[PDB]
Symmetry: C6
């Protein structure tokens, strides 16, 4: 909804956004939204995401699809009304994104999702890209494991000519939706087939905000299939724009640069990652 | 409608347009249109704005959507007829923009919305853009607070991968419509996802005129996601064209240039803004 | 319709076309067509113009829209048949343009619309363009007043982010239609939003001929929002092509060049205009 | 239909095609096809041409439109079947072009349409183009009068911002159809608005063959509104391709070059035209 | 259908494909397929070809169109099923191309269609192109007569502004279908209007295979209307790709180069042709 | 579906993926999936592939098309549901690709399909491309025979102007589907007509994953019809991206480079192939 501010309430907002990344316990936002989701009335639509055509499918708190749901409205503090209606498996009324409020007044954050190697990482979408045909796949997996920490990370596979890989966009958004509804750390191996259909365009536009609001973090590989020219600059550009954080390869083997948006109007941070391969190409990110 | 003029009535018009920016009390036009709006017959359609498809949704004076409204015509002094009809939540007959006359004979103005730091600022749409990845967000907020003055400013969030950010275009125009119907100072953080769908194109084309007629002022961030080439010149160009005022970054840190259209065929003005950051990236615009 | 000629009747035609610009009393064609229009059977469709979709709306002699009109045919001298039919507010059968004959055998003229400062000006469409972000607006208004002479000129406002400006294309063509049906001198401030929809393309293609046939003159501002490169050459080009007359800015402040098509296959004329600003940006065109 | 040949019948065909341009009396083919048309059963569809949408309207021998015609088939010598069916004013079955056979075995000709100034001119389509903004209009008219000889030439006006000019494509094809059904010499002033809609594309593709088959000759002005660059080379190119003859301006004032296709696989001829202006821009083509 | 091979059966296939061009009696494949076609059950669909829309029309062995045909399936050795169904004049089920098997296991051939001047020529599609505005027409005709040998060749005329020339794409494919069903040597004068509609694209993609399977040879003129730049290289490229054989003009007057694909994975051959003009532009290809 | 991992289960996965290419017996995966397929309930949909329109057709284990299949759902370990429904010959519900699980937890492999000349070759899709108009056809066949080893390889022919070649995209996917359901080694001669329709785009996106999952290997020829410029770099690029393995021609006659993806995030391997022609263009790949 819309929010009103004067100097004083704006300064409080910024302080809270700053704390959401810098001082809140890592993964606390995720635990908080998981709590909000489980308190959702059984059967209530909680998430809507676009499929290939541009239409949207809807899920409940247990990541089960909703196919029929009689129109229901909700009045916000803003005075604005929220309406949701599902019919024949598709949203008849509503909007893409979260259908229940996970944030309230606290918006514009990049909730800390985890801490590793002396650095805090933001929830939201992280695109791993850069100098083509490098080791993006091993990197998204190492990041997944490291950010997972005590927990397992979820892997969404899509659009690679390898065994067991789904290449149908509608199965892909179904996996993404389930992943965000159930896990704090998600890896998407290849946003290749995505970047264009309306559903695909919808995804690039919505995923970061959906993850950041949940407090989960989606680590997506984007190997520029495009030339190995300066088209990689445009890819990086498009990526910076729809990503909460960016991870780009450098001219130094095994080294990557992490660029993080810490919150609305807040400072962008950067740190470097050193990595190395073990057996069977398992990559390890060096810490101390 | 159309207006007729001879030398004498034209000179009077220009004098009045000149006064609307230069000598009228800041925010007086807004107060006046608020008065016109509240005297509108209950239930009367007052504003129509386009959604993603190109269709338009309609609101009443209290920023509540109208879904059903039997056809109604109105004869203007011009002899032209205005017809409005809403059905199934969409305008069946009418036009995008204000559906009740807020201006009358007094058109082509950039009604002073506020005065700050020795400068008068126009109502209408203000696009904040320029040299990519700068501090556009902190700037739109500081401008919002400063122009708000004694009042709070309204913030419309859209299309950024941060918590609580709507990324659905139809929710976006709903937020904009409510904002203009209810507040004199409005901030839109990111016209990114907009600049293309018909609704988006409609918005760029309509928003400035809608705001200027209301006397409100919409301060919109436009971070060129495009290259950091001379595509920024085209962005600036597109922005100049659909903006009442333009605010662009310069080669000097914290400095911005404000270019203002003071009214139809009137002189374009320019002044500079100096700014600095405080705690939690709160930006302050220097005055004296 | 089609016309047949041998050397003799062709020489007569050219003489008459030459007289229509050079020797007929200024504005006499307009008065003549006004006469033809008022002698039109009440309720008869007299003008059809395209709306955004490409469909056309129809007006009667009093500039009132026709929504229902049973099919009616008319046999021309040519042997060709003219059919008009309106249904549900849209032309079911007919063509864009004048639906009653205002010219007869006398076609291919640029009927003198007025004389000012020692020069005769043609009816039809006049596009004021050139070296971007100049004083096009003040110029179209000064030209409007000057060509109006004893009469007031009609102003059609469209697509500018200023108070009271319509930005809906369908209201725009409605204003244009009323303007041409009722006034000899018309000013269109900004063909910006137009130059693309089918309605818009229809307008560029039809307006000049409609005005020339009526004997009215439409003075349209066209500020190339495009680069300030040599794209202005293409704009000028597109403008020359659909304009009866062109008015372009020069490298000399306040100076403009007027290029006029005096009629079918006749000589194109050129003269220069000197102008200066007064109070509140009112522009004056120097004469003697 | 298709035709079979061996060396002997092919040599006869070429001889006949050669005679159709070089030795047949000028305009004899036209008189012959007029005879074929008048012997057509009353009400029989004789010509189909495409309108803007790509659909086709159909005419009878008197240039009257057919709106209803029950399906009718015809078996050709080729074994191929020709079917025509009109419904609701549009061809339901058939093809664009002549619906009755005007040629028989004699195809691939450029039937001499007239002789003037010591040169024979082909029927078919003649595009007058070249070095932009020249005197194309005066030239098509002089050619019209000269080729008309003892007869008057027909003028089809279209898409110029001048009085009485139709700018609706569907009225345009109606004029062209009537013109070819009734006159040997036709002038089209401006193929501008045409060169793109399907109807327009259909016209460029069909007009030459339709005229050549009738033995009439359409002299069409094509002023490249495009740049005055080497885009004129592409225009000329597109023109050469769909024209039976080309008439292009040269670097010498009043001089034009005529390039003629004399028939299928036959020699292309070229000759030059000298012209000069008289009173009221009437152009005269010098002969002896 | 699909075919299985091991080293031995593959070597046999290549030997047979080699023989189909190099040692089989010229035109023997055509005679063989003519035999297969005449043994087809009366009324059986034998050929399907696409019309402008992308839909397909169907013919029987006598080149008569089929408009109604109840669904019928056929099981191949491959296990694959072939289904054909015609309704309302269009294929409801089936595929473009031959609907009865003319080849069996013997596929990937360029069956010798004729021998002339010491060279064997392949069946399939032959595109005659190169250095624009040359003598492509005279060449396709001389080739048609020479390859015809004892038989007449069939001429399909299309898209040229000359008398009797069809310019409707749907009549064109009807002519092509009949030609291939009935003659071993076919000339198409101008693939101009074709190279784009779906039917046209279908034709470029299907014609070579259809002809090669029949054993007939289609000699098509392709005059690049495009620039006379190096766009001719792209034309040649597109032509090489969809042609069984290519015939291109050279820098030497009257000389042409013939490039032939002799079969699947077999050697491409080249030889030169010398030609000269006789009376009425009849071209003769020199032999001994 | 999605998979969860911690460091330990991820290391096991990589080990198993490494074994799937490096140590499993060649062709063992194919035999395994053949087993899974034959244990599939009779009539069960096992494969869905897209046709030209973008819709998908469905096959059973015996490569027979399914036209009617009442909706059936399946709950995965993931919690995700799989639904399949066929109606009127098209998938009403489901996804493109394998409809029964052939992989389970073991995904992201490039199952060894065969071993020849001291090298192991991956299943999945292999595109043979490079320096235009070379010997791609002979190469795909030699590779087919060699990888077939003791078995015959299946050949799918498409879009070449040669006898017996299908050029209809829908017959093409039917052949591909049957080939993958029934053979371990498949050759597709020409992906030309493919690289664009939605079906075609679907194929490029799906084929590699389908083959890799089955453990079969599709050897597809891709002769860049495009320029012989550096467009071949883009072709190679697009090819690398959707291929499990790439085979490219080099500057050395008869030599080719094989680039293999050995599995998810695993090392890409490269080796060289030397070849030579025998009688009738049969190509032999040198081993020892
Ligand atoms: N042990 C290793 N040492 C060096 N490079 C490796 C090792 N293991 C894997 N790689 C690289 O990791 C990448 C494999 O994952 P893949 O997804 O195909 O790459 P990409 O990130 O280019 O899309 C390849 O570029 C491969 O060469
Ligand atoms: N205290 C600060 N000092 C300097 N720069 C800051 C400070 N705080 C925030 N910024 C800058 O403000 C911007 C953050 O807002 P954001 O919307 O992401 O930027 P942008 O205007 O480029 O779209 C970043 O470019 C960030 O680096
Ligand atoms: N008194 C004046 N002296 C010089 N320039 C003026 C004066 N008044 C107005 N202008 C110029 O007239 C133009 C205002 O009308 P506007 O429609 O916005 O311009 P444009 O023709 O570029 O589209 C501006 O470019 C403005 O700077
Ligand atoms: N008497 C004349 N002397 C020289 N030029 C003339 C004369 N009369 C007309 N013209 C030229 O003929 C042309 C007028 O016809 P028009 O259709 O507008 O031209 P175009 O062929 O460029 O499209 C103009 O270019 C005009 O300047
Ligand atoms: N006797 C001849 N001598 C030289 N050239 C000739 C002769 N007869 C015809 N031609 C050429 O043959 C061609 C005519 O056929 P056409 O189809 O129009 O040509 P194109 O192959 O360029 O499309 C022309 O280029 C013409 O100049
Ligand atoms: N014996 C041979 N010696 C050299 N080249 C050969 C031999 N046999 C066939 N070729 C080449 O193999 C190719 C034939 O197969 P084709 O599919 O048409 O080629 P491409 O791979 O270019 O698409 C041709 O380029 C041909 O010249
Ligand atoms: Mg990857
Ligand atoms: Mg911003
Ligand atoms: Mg202006
Ligand atoms: Mg002209
Ligand atoms: Mg030709
Ligand atoms: Mg090949």
């Amino acid at each position: 909804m819309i929010h009103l501010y004067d100097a004083k309430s704006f300064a409080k907002l910024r302080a809270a956004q700053y704390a959401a990344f810098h001082t809140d316990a890592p993964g606390s936002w995720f635990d908080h939204t998981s709590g909000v989701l489980e308190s959702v009335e059984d059967g209530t639509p909680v998430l809507a995401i676009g499929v290939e055509s541009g239409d949207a499918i809807v899920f409940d708190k247990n990541a089960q699809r909703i196919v029929a749901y009689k129109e229901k409205s909700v009045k916000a503090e803003d005075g604005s009304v929220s309406v949701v209606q599902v019919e024949n498996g598709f949203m008849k009324q509503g909007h893409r994104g979260w259908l229940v409020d996970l944030t309230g007044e606290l918006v514009g954050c990049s909730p800390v999702v985890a801490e590793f190697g002396g650095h805090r990482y933001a929830s939201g979408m992280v695109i791993v890209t850069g100098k083509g045909n490098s080791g993006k796949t091993p990197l998204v997996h190492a990041l997944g494991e490291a950010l997972g920490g005590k927990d397992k990370y979820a892997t969404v596979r899509f659009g690679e000519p390898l065994s067991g890989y789904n290449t149908d966009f509608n199965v892909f958004v179904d996996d993404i939706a389930r992943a965000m509804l159930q896990h704090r750390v998600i890896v998407i191996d290849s946003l290749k087939n995505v970047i264009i259909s309306r559903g695909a365009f919808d995804l690039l536009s919505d995923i970061g905000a959906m993850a950041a609001s949940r407090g989960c973090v989606v680590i997506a590989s984007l190997n520029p299939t495009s030339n190995d020219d300066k088209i990689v600059e445009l890819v990086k550009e498009a990526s910076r724009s729809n990503s909460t954080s960016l991870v780009i390869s450098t001219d130094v083997d095994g080294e990557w640069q992490v660029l993080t948006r810490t919150g609305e109007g807040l400072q962008r941070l950067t740190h470097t990652l050193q990595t190395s391969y073990g057996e069977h190409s398992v990559l390890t990110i060096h810490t101390s």
